[PDB]
């Protein structure tokens, strides 16, 4: 899309893909990690 942005046509062939990303995947990351602060932050100190 960066390569095609230099082109006049602003229509995006993967518009469905980018909207799905921005509306679901990026916030899915948000909710998953905010629910699981501790699990990825395990430091062998037996946290929980």
């Amino acid at each position: 899309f960066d390569g095609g942005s230099r082109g006049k046509g602003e229509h995006f062939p993967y518009e469905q893909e980018i909207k799905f990303f921005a509306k679901v995947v990026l916030p899915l990351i948000d909710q998953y990690f905010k629910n699981h602060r501790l699990y990825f932050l395990s430091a062998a100190s037996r946290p929980l």
């Binding site: 990825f40 932050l41 395990s42 430091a43």
Partner: protein, 292 residues
């Protein structure tokens, strides 16, 4: 992030991944400050500056906040990570001290970023005369052949020449405290210097000799409870002299920046040294501006 586990065991692609993540962010904000200096008159570089202030500053600030709160960074520090960190420090300190229409918009943002960075960074930078004691310093790491290999001035004072030293900064802030200079004339000092001293003394408390009569004068830096006392007294007495005028949310936020220090300080001093704080905050009964 768990960079401790990632660094102790992890793939070199991931290593180079975060190394490039920090190198690219560095060169980004350095080119940003440069094009800002050549930006005497008011678009691509302007977009880069906006992108900086909206994304690059918050992410670096947050990741350094996590590093600090985990008391992290000693193993995170590796090749060229020192160089990148010193460059970034000099850069945002230069922007914070500098005065421009771009600076007065996000000067708070760079303030919190530098507050995070100074604590996060794992080598005592504000003191440089006896800093050689730290083996984790890249000067001890590099021997001499690696010094010849990498392009660095080989002098800690030369790597960060624009930044001052801790003793001259503390005497200058004491001087401006007793003079009672208003924030409008010199916003930069009361905006950036205080987060420097706060984070620095907060994390090199215990990497000061006062906790550690052991390994004395093998310390990476020298610090004292009297230094802590002096500068938080300066903070309380500057706020004393300047709640009456110019108010501002900056004094509202320096309270939370000084929160670590007021947790650090011992309670016999708290009694009869913040009793003044409670009475000075309330002596302005006529005013309504928030404090603490």
């Amino acid at each position: 992030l768990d960079a401790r586990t990632v660094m102790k065991t992890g793939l070199e692609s991931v290593k180079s991944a975060l190394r490039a993540f920090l190198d690219n962010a560095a060169e980004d904000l350095e080119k940003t400050m440069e094009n800002l200096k050549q930006g005497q008159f008011t678009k691509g570089v302007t977009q880069i500056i906006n992108y900086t202030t909206v994304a690059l500053l918050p992410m670096l600030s947050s990741l350094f906040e996590h590093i600090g709160q985990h008391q992290f960074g000693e193993d995170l520090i590796l090749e060229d990570v020192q160089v990148s960190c010193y460059r970034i420090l000099t850069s945002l300190y230069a922007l914070g001290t500098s005065k421009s229409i771009y600076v007065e918009r996000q000067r708070s943002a760079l303030g919190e970023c530098l507050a995070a960075f100074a604590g996060a960074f794992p080598v005592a930078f504000l003191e440089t005369h006896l800093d050689k004691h730290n083996i984790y310093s890249i000067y001890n790491t590099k021997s001499s052949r690696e010094r010849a290999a990498l392009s660095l001035p080989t002098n800690v004072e030369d790597v960060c020449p624009n930044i001052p030293s801790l003793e001259k900064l503390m005497e200058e802030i004491v001087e401006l405290a007793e003079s009672g200079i208003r924030y409008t004339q010199m916003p930069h000092v009361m905006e950036v210097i205080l987060p420097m001293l706060c984070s620095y003394m907060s994390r090199w408390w215990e990497h000061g000799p006062e906790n550690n009569p052991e390994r004395a004068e093998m310390c990476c830096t020298a610090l004292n409870s009297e230094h802590m006392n002096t500068l938080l007294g300066n903070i309380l007495k500057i706020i004393y002299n300047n709640l009456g005028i110019d108010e501002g949310a900056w004094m509202k936020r320096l309270a939370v920046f000084s929160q670590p220090i007021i947790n650090k300080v011992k309670p016999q001093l708290l009694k009869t040294h913040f009793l003044p704080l409670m009475e000075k905050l309330k002596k302005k009964a006529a005013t309504v501006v928030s404090e603490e």
